[PDB]
Design a protein around this ligand. Sequence first.
Ligand SMILES: Cc1ncc(COP(=O)(O)O)c(CNc2csc(C(=O)O)c2)c1O
Ligand SMILES: Cc1ncc(COP(=O)(O)O)c(CNc2csc(C(=O)O)c2)c1O
Lengths: 379, 379
Amino acid sequence: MFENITAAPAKINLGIGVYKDETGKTPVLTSVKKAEQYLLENETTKNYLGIDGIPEFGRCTQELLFGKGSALINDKRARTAQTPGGTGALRVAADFLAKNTSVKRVWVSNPSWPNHKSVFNSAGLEVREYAYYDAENHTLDFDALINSLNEAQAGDVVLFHGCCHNPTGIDPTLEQWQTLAQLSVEKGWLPLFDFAYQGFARGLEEDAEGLRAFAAMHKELIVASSYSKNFGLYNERVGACTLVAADSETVDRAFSQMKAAIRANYSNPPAHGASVVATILSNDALRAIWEQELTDMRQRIQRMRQLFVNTLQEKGANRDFSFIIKQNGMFSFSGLTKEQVLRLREEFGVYAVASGRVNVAGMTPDNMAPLCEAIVAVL
Amino acid sequence: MFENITAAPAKINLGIGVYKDETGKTPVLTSVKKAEQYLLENETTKNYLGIDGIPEFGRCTQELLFGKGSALINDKRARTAQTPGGTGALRVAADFLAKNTSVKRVWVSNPSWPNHKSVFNSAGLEVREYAYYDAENHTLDFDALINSLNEAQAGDVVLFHGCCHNPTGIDPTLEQWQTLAQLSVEKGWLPLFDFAYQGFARGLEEDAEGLRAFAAMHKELIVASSYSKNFGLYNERVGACTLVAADSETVDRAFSQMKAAIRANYSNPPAHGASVVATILSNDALRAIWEQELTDMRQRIQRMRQLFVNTLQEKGANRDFSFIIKQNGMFSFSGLTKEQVLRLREEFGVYAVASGRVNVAGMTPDNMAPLCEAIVAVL
Ligand SMILES: Cc1ncc(COP(=O)(O)O)c(CNc2csc(C(=O)O)c2)c1O
Ligand SMILES: Cc1ncc(COP(=O)(O)O)c(CNc2csc(C(=O)O)c2)c1O
């Protein structure tokens, strides 16, 4: 059966995918440790969660996404399933859409996270790309984006990164999100928000502005969110798939099929990480400690963005890198070519992805001068 | 998009799906609590696991399945991916097979766990049923099983419950497993073992006899195993998908595509529960405490089987229920009809599934007399 299977395709780490602190560690957040000790002391069973996971986790997720007092929440228009990470939320969404709707195609930005194509194709959905990145101004090529998406038909899904676009760190402005929201309603797209970095651009509420501008205009949308980065809970697989429909009767009926797609995949979701999140978000004291830890991560990344720009200038780059200051989250394109990236790895032991994307959170005050010296050497 | 979606289809609890102790609780195992405290004290990161999860978890899983010193292990013929439960292992297997092989059909016993059909159909695989249960002798209808499976073509998958068949509690004898192993090689079936109850029939090693008789005869097989019940880790989603091929080069190449199927589903697996299992299995002291807790569960179930038979006789059933003593694991068919089960629920508040399957682990010395009185009333 297996004998002819084809194999699947495939000093400083800026090619890393997680946050690192100033010491180069990815420690467990203190709010998380305190929550884990509470769970150790208080859990009395590991009995299965429901298919959609812990109710409090869903409520706290919808409040983070839509805002407390949102009409979507008051009108009971949203249902949330706790999932194994943001990736599990995207796959549950894809399997739900493939089996229960006429969707055939999902539009993803060029560039995006490479796993988007794999997830949607796994569910039998085609992936099409829309333009996104203006590499001369290192900005959002909004006109190209809109022009690309005019090829999208009514009933196609359009995927939007909610904030901290991966890999570019370039997000729509609020006004651009409002223009996209209007266009999406006019063209009949189903928005799918991928929200893996809430809190890493400007703040929890600010980072949800774009999603909330869409939610104000749409009857229907799906959000695949992740707590991997903003709780430092990567390996516990903590995410959510939130389905929104015009009204409670419709969302409840549609969500029953989302639960069927979960049941046929992994049955019900892993409790530990989500219970940590629910414990933190629903407790005033733990939530305050966590919100500050997230602010500390967001601010450290901003300090590294500024220190990277300043240091490249001090090391004689003689090139404008100011675009780095304005970009959001852990990732940016450095503007280096694939061969410069290869040179950086081979000659200097500095590791980035071939696109030139770097994880700014991999930078520290200690490793900045050698990193920048290496980059200047390959310009 | 969603407005026309069709909804998905759907005193004493013997309809429960988990183990209960003599007090009717499903507590966290003590070995698990001790392991969780060790993890709280010692984890310094939640950084992502590899796609296939924790290496020690895979090694300890292969030793439980195949035996320490197995040729399959020595020859590096098996690769294990940690998965979100037994269900996640079955879905990873199904998606791997659908995308990478000629498999179109999986043969499942009639009866089985109802979620088997959902999982395989989700991956685009057809499910066919083979005969299994002789309801007059309350035994394995071996001749019917073999006759059914003669319709299976070379290259079809045949699913076997490794022990504690769900729902019947009726397992092949060793000699029957050896006959099936031989037949499977002759007919070109790919065996898929579903092993959710190792340790609940006779013992860890005894319960793997059938799988090991298959492994001795086959170049290729897949095992989807679960630690939900034997570690009481239901909601932490702890299972494994083990791929076996003729040799290391082949299994490694095939496993690369199994990892691709995981990456497109949930990316990488949840650490907490699997790390508990690896911590317990790789430590002599914790493993001894856990093995005794499992023996205690297995023995309590056997005591309930005996007490149920004896009590039905004392309460005047006047019918042979001795078959219950010989069946394995938490489940048995009581032999009650769907209407007797409905009567039991409505008139007596005793809850079983419509097939008449009961969870013997839901029985306690305290609830046995009323339960048996209720059953006698509906005969
Ligand atoms: C846009 C987007 N979508 C989905 C995901 C998946 O998140 P988790 O499944 O890890 O929660 C992520 C985060 N997953 C991820 C891990 S490393 C990485 C990278 O781009 O390096 C990405 C993301 O950035
Ligand atoms: C034969 C078989 N295959 C797969 C599974 C899935 O196990 P987990 O996904 O819960 O680990 C199980 C256990 N899942 C399960 C939970 S309740 C239940 C039942 O039949 O009541 C079954 C099983 O018995």
